[PDB]
Design a binder for these strands. Structure first.
Lengths: 210, 209
DNA sequence: CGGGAGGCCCGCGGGCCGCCGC
DNA sequence: GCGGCGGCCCGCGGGCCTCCCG
């Protein structure tokens, strides 16, 4: 403890970065668009976007919005370097990892298990933030989400989830699993999930705004 | 697609964003130290670190590391503003929330619950990131953890847990709990958990190079 | 039988609900 | 009945574990 509490001295303002962020976003937007997952595997961590062009009833708008360019993301994720929680890269260095390609791939697999979504109707964009750049990954991801408010980011939860595992079978599958059954593990959960009607209604709210 | 695939076309080269973290990390280091919890409540979202100065056997070494200054944190966390998960911020009708303060206190309180740690032996530092700097919170925390590798984040897991609740009761009591009862809810967990000897043996290792 | 990738655990803490004191 | 405080759900995904191919 120290006498004289003064809140002003704990606040961190440094505007320098906003322009760094808008430079990243700017760049992201012009990166080539590939199918899901990309035709080759690659090393790197970074950020990515998923785009829909199919006609599943609830999402048909995207085939309209995205008809002429990949304009609106359904989802935007990030693959951060290994070591975010414990930072234990302490005596086993690398092996330049490839965690971005891996998530993107994982997400492709999950879609491919759904009954009502066709992986052929998704594409992506992704950026690799190198060496020291890796520090941006999160911040850019937030900006992208602030700009597009992608549906699986701002209305429908659970796309990005891993299995809860035994020990957590009792919890509820996510909204994302209720409307898109089924990853196996989603079907082993006994927990009371949302009711399809509420999730569908949230989705319609999302597509009302001009 | 339509293209070739040219990994190179997706690469973002940047070097100065790292300097921003440096600035934030160094600034954090400078901020006034307060006990746990801080003497007053305050509004803001951001990052905080916790400090030990006590003599509970296993952690006694901190009383020698932090003897002269608040050097090495035992745990580093974050608190992000309300509606961050679905990017509906103080829209309508906040940003005047006080989530940083509030989590610092839930932390104090968990500690107060243990039978073998004394709250007075803990101090803290915190940084508030204001609007539009809150995008950064996540990252500063990660750097702070990379730099200080704080025992609880990197070795004695669990302090971070809120109650897992029903639905998750079959998981294993966390390392942290198994050395620091008694959070009510940890007793409800039924998974096969790690052994005190190996947890203590890991703490001994933390202080050995 | 070691390195990599994907499987299967729980960590951190966000969000929302309910109880409480205004 | 509000909003502040706690408590109890789970999102979101990191990391070790495994299984397999050398």
């Amino acid at each position: 403890h120290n006498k004289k509490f003064d809140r002003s001295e704990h606040v961190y303002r440094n505007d320098s970065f906003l322009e760094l962020i808008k430079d990243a976003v700017r760049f992201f937007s012009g990166t080539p668009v590939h199918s899901l997952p990309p035709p080759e595997r690659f090393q790197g961590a970074g950020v990515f976007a998923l785009y829909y062009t199919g006609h599943y009833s609830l999402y048909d708008e995207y085939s309209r919005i995205n008809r002429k360019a990949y304009n609106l993301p359904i989802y935007v994720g990030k693959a951060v370097p290994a070591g975010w929680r414990q930072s234990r890269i302490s005596d086993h260095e690398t092996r330049a990892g490839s965690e971005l390609s891996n998530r993107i791939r994982e997400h492709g697999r999950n879609i491919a298990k759904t009954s009502n979504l066709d992986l052929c109707d998704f594409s992506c964009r992704f950026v690799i933030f190198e060496a020291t750049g890796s520090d941006m990954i999160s911040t850019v991801e937030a900006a992208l989400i602030k700009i597009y408010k992608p549906l699986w980011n701002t209305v429908v939860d659970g796309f990005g989830n891993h299995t809860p595992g035994a020990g957590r079978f009792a919890q509820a599958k996510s909204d994302w699993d209720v409307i898109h059954p089924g990853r196996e593990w989603a079907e082993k959960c006994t927990g009371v999930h949302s009711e399809p009607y509420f999730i569908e209604e949230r989705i319609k709210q999302y597509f009302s705004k001009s």
